[PDB]
Amino acid sequence: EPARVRCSHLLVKHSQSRRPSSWRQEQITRTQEEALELINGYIQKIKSGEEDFESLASQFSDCSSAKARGDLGAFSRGQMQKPFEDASFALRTGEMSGPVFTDSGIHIILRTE
Ligand SMILES: O=C(N[C@H](Cc1nc2ccc(F)cc2[nH]1)C(=O)O)c1ccc2ccccc2c1
């Protein structure tokens, strides 16, 4: 395991998220169910090749990292929310996670380094 990994992510918030607002929406109104539907729709499009992970993150991620095409840069353990950390360190470089749940909402993660 490396000391740090570098990942990109696409976050879909919902009305029960810790901070239910984003750069793209003043108030997050969608349900948890709708957020998971959106995440699964993105996974299917990335798997078929219909959509690019970083291109989707740049315009649809509820995280301010959308401006960096989803890039969070490098992080060690003990920094990010634990389920996000565990999912990130379990990926190989160039691998994408399935849905990941944190207090911020639902994420898809792409490990880059
Ligand atoms: O907290 C941030 N944005 C939060 C959403 C969020 N991003 C997350 C990433 C990992 C995780 F475990 C939980 C998350 N909740 C926000 O914009 O409300 C955030 C964190 C680190 C960043 C690093 C680089 C660029 C933007 C960042 C935004």
Q: Give the ligand 1 atom nearest the CA of 85.
A: 12
Residue 92: count of CB within 10 angstroms of its CB:
6
Q: How far apart are CA 66 and CA 71, in angstroms?
A: 8
SS3 51: coil
Which residue among 104, 106, 108 has the greatest number of ligand 1 atoms within 8 angstroms of its CB, and so is best to mutate?
104
Distances, alpha carbon 96 to alpha carbons 25, 28, 42, 110, in Å: 26, 25, 12, 4
- The whole domain housing 12 covers 1-113
CATH code, domain carrying 41: 3.10.50.40
Contact criterion met (CB below 8 Å) for 24 and 13: no
Residue 51: count of CB within 10 angstroms of its CB:
16
User: What's the number of domains the chain is made of?
Assistant: 1
Q: Which of 85, 8, 15, 88 is nearest to 54 (CA)?
A: 8
Q: How far apart are CA 81 and CA 104, in angstroms?
A: 9
Q: How far apart are CA 45 and CA 111, in angstroms?
A: 18
Residues found in the chain: 113
Tell me the CA–centroid distance for residue 64 and ligand 1, in Å: 7
Q: How far apart are CA 19 and CA 37, in angstroms?
A: 20
The two three-digit tokens of residue 108, written as one number: 């898809």
The two three-digit tokens of residue 96, written as one number: 């994408």
Residue 74 DSSP class: E
Residue 102 DSSP class: E
Q: Of all protein residues, whose CA lies closest to atom 17 belonging to ligand 1?
A: 63
Burial status of residue 70 (CB atoms within 10 A of its CB: 0-12, 13-18, 19 or more): buried
The two three-digit tokens of residue 39, written as one number: 């995440």
Q: Of all protein residues, whose CA lies closest to atom 15 belonging to ligand 1?
A: 104
SS3 110: strand
